[PDB]
Symmetry: D2
Subunit: 371 residues, 4 copies
C-alpha cells in the first residue's frame, strides 16, 4: 500500500502533549504538523525539537512562515490569528506535500493503541461492498458506540429537533458499496458533546463497545476535528470555518469543525463517498474550560444549525470533485440564507452564511493556486 | 385556625385550565385571582364567569382596573404589559385583601389531591421545634425528592458551580426551632428545570418519593412561582422581578421568579423563618415552548446567577420585618453589582442589579402606601 | 426622438402628493409607477384612480401583483416589505416595459417647471464632445450649484475625510467626449444632506445658481433616488440596496440610494458613461422626521462609506454592459470586505458587503430572466 | 482674600503641555494636581519633576497612591482606569486639602493671559446684586460670546430640540442678587462643540467678543470640565460621571462632564447659586481625534440628553448643601428613568440612570467619609 499520513495539530501550549502523542506517531512514520500562533509560548518550539531528536518527524512553522505561504496564495486575510482556525494551515501544508491521509487532532487527544495511524488509514481502502448503517430518521448517534455515564448523550453538533424522536428510529445494516474517505475516531474520558450536555450531566465515556460503522447515503452524524482522518481528495471540503460572527449581537464560536464536519460529509455523499465512525479511539483529558463560557459561545451557532441541516437535504449539489462540490455548496448556503425563516434568523445571522461562503471559495481558490 | 388563601395566576390562555384547577379551589373556599393582560382574549373572562356560577370565588380584573389600582399607589410604570410580571398585581391584590396565604401558580400547574390548599396552609402553623434538613455545601436539591427519568436533574435556578461537588455533600437532619413561611410544592410530569437540562435529557417526573423537608439556616434552594405558598408577612419580599434587561446585548427572561424565590428565602432566614419543599404536588403538563428560545432567554441570567448567590452569603441583611429586610436587600445588591468580578459582568450586567433594586423599593413603596 | 419616460415613486401616504406631481407628468405623457406597501392606506389607490381620470398615466400595482411578479423571476425574498426598498419593483417594472428613461423620485419632491420630464431626457442624447467638470481631489460638491444658508453644505453620502481639503481643490472644465446616462436633479427647500449636517445648521436651499455640470472620469459625487433620471441601459446597475444590517449591533438605514448612486456611477465610468448634475430642480418639502433618529440610522453607514469609496478607486472593474459590470462590482465588494481595516470593520460590518453583493447578483439574475 | 486654587488635569501624554501651562499657574501660586493613569508613560513624571524645580507646585500621585486613597474611603471600584474619569481623584484631592477653587482643565487647554487664576477666583466673591442674563426659552448659547466661523454653533451638550427656536428667544438682563460658584471659561481655536457640529462646519473660534454673563434662575447652559472653576462648596456636585454604559448596545462616552456640568448647575440654582460664562479664555489646540469615532461615542448620550434635561425641570430638588442636594438629585434621576418615554429609552438606557445614581451616592459617600 505505502500510505503516507500527516497529523495536524494547532496549539498554544508548551508542548507537553508531545510526550504522550509522539510514540504512536513516530512508530508509524507519520508526520506531525504543529501550527503555533502569535500567543504561543517559545517552549513549544523547544518541545518540537526535543522530540525531533527522538525520531518523530514533527514540523512547527513559525507565524512568519505561515503568513509567507498564505500571502503567496493570495489569501493573507483568510486565516486569523489568536484562533484555532490556524489548523487550516496544517490542512493546506499536508495537502501540498502529497500526504495520503490528513489526521486532524487537538493537543489533548491521546491515542490509546499503537496502531492509531494504521486504523486511520481506512480512508484509503477504496470502494468495496461493505456493511453500511442506515437510520430511518436520517441521523446516527456516534456516542451510542460508547459507554457513557450517567445517561445517554448526543455528540456536539447533533440537531436538537431530532433528539427526542431518535430513540424510536429504525437502524438497519445492509451490504452496500461504499468508499470511506472520512474516519471520525471516538474518544474516551470527556466525550465530544456540546456545552448544554456537559453542563447538564457531565458525561464520561467509559469504554468503546459499539465497534465501527459506515453510514449509508442519507444518514448523517456530526464529525469533529479532534480525532478525524480525511483522505487527501476530501481535504478541500474540510475547511475549518471561521468563527467570531455575531448572531443577534452574540459572536459564535466552538462550531468551526461542526460546519466542516457536515460540509465534507455532504460533499462526500454527493461524490459517492461515505463517513466512518469508530476506531481508533483516543483519550480526551479535556483542557480546563469555563462551561458557562462555552455555552455563551455555542448558543449563537446552535440556534441556526437545525435549520441549516434541514435545507441542506433539500439542495442537491453539483460538481465532479471535492473542489467543484464544495464551491457548489457555498452557493447553496447563500440560497439557504435567504429562504430560511425563523426568529433567530436576523439580518446578521443570514449574513453569516454569505461571508462564510466567500471564505469557502477563498479557501478553494488557494488550493487551486497550488495545484 | 380559620385560614384564608388566595391563589394568584396570570395567563393569556382561553381559560380552559379552570376546569381542572377549580375543583380543588372551590372545595376549600379559596379565592382565585386571575390577572389577564392586553394580549388576553375575551374567552378568559367568559371562563372566569362560567366557573363563578359553579361556586368558585374567582376574580379577573381587567387591565383598566389593574392600571387604576397601580396608578393610585404611585406605581403606574412598575409592572409592564405583555409579560407574566403582571402576577405582581395578584400578589398586591391578595395582600391588600388580607389573605393569610398567597399561592402563586401558573395556568398549567394542576393539583393532584383534594387537600391542595390545606397542605399549602403550612405557612401559618407558626414556629415549632421540627426536623430541619441541612447540607454541608449549603445547597439542597429539591428534585431529589422526585422520581425523575432518565437521570438525576437539578431545578431551575440551582447554581451550576455547586452541582458537581453536591454529590459529596453531607445531608443531616436535626431537631431545631423553625418557622415555615414559604412552601414550594413539587411538580410531576415536566419538572421545573432550566432549558439546559430539558434540552439535554428531557426529564419526566414520575412520582414524589422524598416526602417534605424544611431547610435549616444556611441551606438554600431555588423557589419558583408555579406551585408556591407564601405567608402574607413574607409577601412583600416575593416581588416577581422584572425581566428584559440585556446582558452583553441579550435581554434576560424566564428568571423573574428565580430571583424572587431566592430573595424571599434570604429575607426569611434573616428574620428567623424557613422554606419548606414537598407537598402539595401538582401535575405540570407544560405549555408548548421553543426550547432553543428558552435557552436564548435564560443564558444571560445563568451567566450571573452563581456570582450573585455567592456574594449574598457575604452580605448580612438588616431589618425587623420583610419590608425593611427586602429594602436592605436591594441596597446590598447594588454593592454586589460593583464588587463582583467576571467576564460576564459588563456595564449593562451591573446596571441590571441597580435598576432591579430600584424596582424592588418601588414595589415596597407601593405596599407601604397601602398599609 | 420619441423618448419614453416612467417615473417611479414608492409611498405609504394617502396620495395627496399626486395633486402637485401629476400636472408636470401628464403634460409630458410620462407614466407614474406608484409602488405601495403592506402598511399603505387604501386612500392611495383612490387617489391614483382620481388622477387617472384627469389623463395621468399612473399605475399602482397591489402588493399581491408585486409578489406574483417577483415570484415568477425566482426572487420572492429579494425585496422586503415595510420599507422604501420596494422602489426596485418600479425600477424593474419600468425596465421590462421598455421605457427609455426611468425617473426615481419620492412622494415629497415636486417639479418646479413644466419641462421637468424634458430636462430629464438628457440621458438619451448619446455621446458628444461636451464640457466636462473635473476636480483635483476626485470629488464634486453638487450643493455648490445651489444657494444654501446659513453656510455651505455637502450632499448626503459625501465622504467626510475629503470635506476639509475640498475647498482648496482645483476645478477645471475641458471639452471632452461624454455619454450622459444618469442625471441627478437638484432640490430646493430642504436639500439632500445627511442627518449630521441637518442637525448642525439646518440647511435651506434658496435657489439654483450653479447651472449644470457633467463630471469627468475620476470625479465622483453621491447620487440620490429622489430626483434622478437613469437611462434604461444603466438601470440594471441602479439597484436600491437593502438596508437593515447591524454594524456593531446597530442596523443601518437611509443609505440605500447612497450605494446605488455610487454603484451606478462607478459602473457608468467603466463603460465610458458619465453622470450629470443640475436641472431639473424640484421642491423638497421634506416629510416630518426625527432628526436624532435619522442620525441613529445613518451613523452605521457613515462609519464605513469612506473606506468603501477609497477601495473602489483601487479595484478596476470588468464587463461589457451594465449587467456584467454590476456583477463584477459585487465580487469587488467582497474582496474589499476582507482587505479593508479599521475600528468600525467588525465581522458583521464586513458581512454587510458580502450579503449585499449576493443581493446585487440576485437583482441582476432577475433582470436576465426577463430578457 | 488669600484665595487658594488647585488645577485638576488628568492626562496620558508625555507632559509637554506643562511648558505652556506652568507659567500662568506658578505665577499665581496655584497647585497643579496631575492625575496619571495606567496607560501613562514615565515621561509625565519626569516632566512634573522638571517643572517642580522651576517653582511650580505640581503633584503627580502614582496609580498606587490613588488606589490607596480610594480604598481607604471605601470606594475602590468607583473610578475606573484607562479613562479620563480619573480626574475625580483630582477633584477629591483638591477638596480634601482645603482649596477654595478647583479648576478643571485638560492637557490641551492653555491659558492666554497672566491673570488666568485671578479671573477664575470669581467663584469666591460671595453673593452680590449683579446683572444676570435670562432667556425666554431657559437656554443660553455661550458660544454666542465667541467669534466662530464659518457659521454660528452650539456648545457640546446643548439640547437639540431647543436649537431651532432659540433664535427667537428673548434675552434680557436685570439687576438681581446672585452668587457665582461655577465659572466656565471660554476657549479659542477649536471650540467645545459636539462631534455633529465639528463634522459639519469644522468651527474655529477666532476671538472672545461677548464678554461675561451670569445666568439667572431658570436659564441653563452646558458646562464642560476643560476650563471650569468650581468653588469648594459646589465640588461635591461636580462628580465626573462614569461613561461606558450601553444605549441600544452602544456604549456612551465623551459626555462625562456634560452631566456633571448640568448636575452641578441644577444643584447650584436650588441652593441660590449661579453659573458664570466668559473669562478666563484659553487656547484649545485640540488633540487629534477620529471625528467619526467621536460621533459613534456621543450619539448614545445625545439620544437621551433632551429628555433628561426636560424632566429635570419637573423635579424640584431638596437639601441644604450640595451633598444633600446632589444625593436628592440622584434619586430624582431614578424617578425620571421610569417616567420618561421614547424610542431611545430601552431597558439598558433606563438602567444607565440607575447605575449612575448609585455612583453619585458612592461619590458623595466618599466625601462624607473624609469630612
Ligand atoms: C475552539 C473550540 O472550542 C474548538 O475546540 C474543540 O475541542 P474542545 O472544545 O475540547 O477545546 P480544546 O480541545 O481544549 O482546544 C481545541 C484546540 O484549539 C487550540 N487553541 C485554543 N486557543 C487557540 C489560539 O488562540 N490559537 C491557536 N492557534 N490554537 C488555539 C488548543 O490548543 C486545542 O488544541 C472543539 O470543541 C471546538 O471546535
Ligand atoms: C415566562 C417564564 O418562562 C416563566 O414561566 C414559568 O413557568 P414555565 O417556564 O413552565 O412557562 P409557563 O408555565 O408555560 O408560563 C408561565 C405563565 O406565564 C403566563 N404568561 C405567558 N405570557 C404572558 C403574557 O404575555 N402576559 C401575561 N400576563 N402572562 C403571560 C402563562 O399564562 C403562564 O401561566 C417560569 O419558568 C418562568 O418564571
Ligand atoms: C428611507 C430613507 O430615509 C430614504 O429616504 C430618502 O429621502 P428622505 O430622507 O427625505 O425621506 P423621505 O423623502 O421623507 O421618504 C423617502 C420615501 O420612502 C417612502 N417610504 C417610507 N416608509 C416606507 C415604507 O414603509 N414602505 C414603502 N414602500 N415606502 C416607504 C416615503 O413615502 C418616501 O417617498 C433618502 O434620504 C433615503 O434613502
Ligand atoms: C474623553 C472625552 O472626550 C472628554 O474629553 C474632553 O475634551 P476633548 O473632547 O477635547 O478631548 P481631549 O481634550 O483631547 O482629552 C480630554 C482629557 O482626557 C485625557 N485622557 C484621555 N484618555 C485618557 C485615559 O485613558 N486615561 C486618563 N486618565 N486620561 C485620559 C486627556 O489627556 C485629556 O487631557 C471632553 O470633550 C470629554 O469629557
Ligand atoms: Mn479537547
Ligand atoms: Mn408551566
Ligand atoms: Mn424626502
Ligand atoms: Mn481638548
Amino acid at each position: 500500500r505505502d500510505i503516507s499520513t500527516a497529523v495536524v495539530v494547532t496549539t498554544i501550549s508548551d508542548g507537553g502533549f508531545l510526550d504522550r502523542l509522539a510514540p504512536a506517531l513516530r512508530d508509524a512514520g507519520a508526520r506531525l504538523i504543529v501550527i503555533p500562533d502569535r500567543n504561543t509560548g517559545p517552549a513549544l518550539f523547544a518541545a518540537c525539537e526535543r522530540h525531533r531528536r527522538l525520531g518523530l518527524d514533527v514540523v512547527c512553522p513559525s507565524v512568519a512562515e505561515q503568513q509567507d505561504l498564505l500571502e503567496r496564495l493570495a489569501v493573507p486575510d483568510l486565516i486569523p490569528y489568536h484562533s484555532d482556525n490556524r489548523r487550516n494551515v496544517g490542512y493546506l501544508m499536508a495537502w501540498m506535500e502529497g500526504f495520503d491521509v490528513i489526521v486532524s487532532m487537538d493537543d489533548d487527544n491521546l491515542p490509546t493503541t499503537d496502531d492509531f495511524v494504521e486504523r486511520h488509514q481506512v480512508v484509503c481502502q477504496g470502494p468495496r461492498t461493505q456493511p453500511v448503517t442506515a437510520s430511518s430518521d436520517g441521523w446516527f448517534n456516534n456516542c451510542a458506540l460508547l459507554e457513557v455515564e450517567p445517561t445517554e448523550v448526543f455528540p456536539r453538533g447533533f440537531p436538537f429537533h431530532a433528539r427526542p424522536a431518535h430513540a424510536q428510529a429504525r437502524t438497519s445494516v445492509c451490504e452496500r458499496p461504499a468508499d470511506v474517505r472520512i474516519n471520525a475516531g471516538l474518544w474516551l474520558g470527556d466525550p465530544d458533546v456540546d456545552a448544554i450536555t456537559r453542563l447538564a450531566v457531565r458525561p464520561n465515556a467509559l469504554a468503546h463497545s459499539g465497534g465501527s460503522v459506515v453510514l449509508a447515503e442519507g444518514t448523517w452524524c456530526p464529525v469533529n476535528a479532534q480525532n478525524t482522518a480525511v483522505h487527501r481528495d476530501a481535504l478541500p471540503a474540510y475547511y475549518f470555518l471561521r468563527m467570531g460572527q455575531p448572531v443577534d449581537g452574540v459572536p459564535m464560536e466552538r462550531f468551526g469543525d461542526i460546519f466542516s464536519g457536515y460540509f465534507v460529509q455532504v460533499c462526500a455523499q454527493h461524490l459517492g463517498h461515505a463517513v466512518r465512525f469508530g476506531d481508533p479511539v483516543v483519550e480526551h483529558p479535556r483542557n480546563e474550560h469555563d462551561l458557562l463560557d462555552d455555552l455563551h459561545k455555542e448558543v449563537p451557532a446552535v440556534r441556526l444549525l437545525d435549520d441549516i441541516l434541514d435545507h441542506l437535504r433539500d439542495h442537491p449539489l453539483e460538481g465532479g470533485d471535492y473542489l467543484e462540490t464544495y464551491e457548489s455548496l457555498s452557493y447553496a448556503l447563500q440560497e439557504i440564507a435567504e429562504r430560511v425563516n425563523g426568529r433567530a434568523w436576523s439580518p446578521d445571522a443570514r449574513a453569516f452564511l454569505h461571508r462564510s461562503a466567500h471564505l469557502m471559495r477563498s479557501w478553494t481558490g488557494a488550493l487551486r493556486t497550488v495545484a
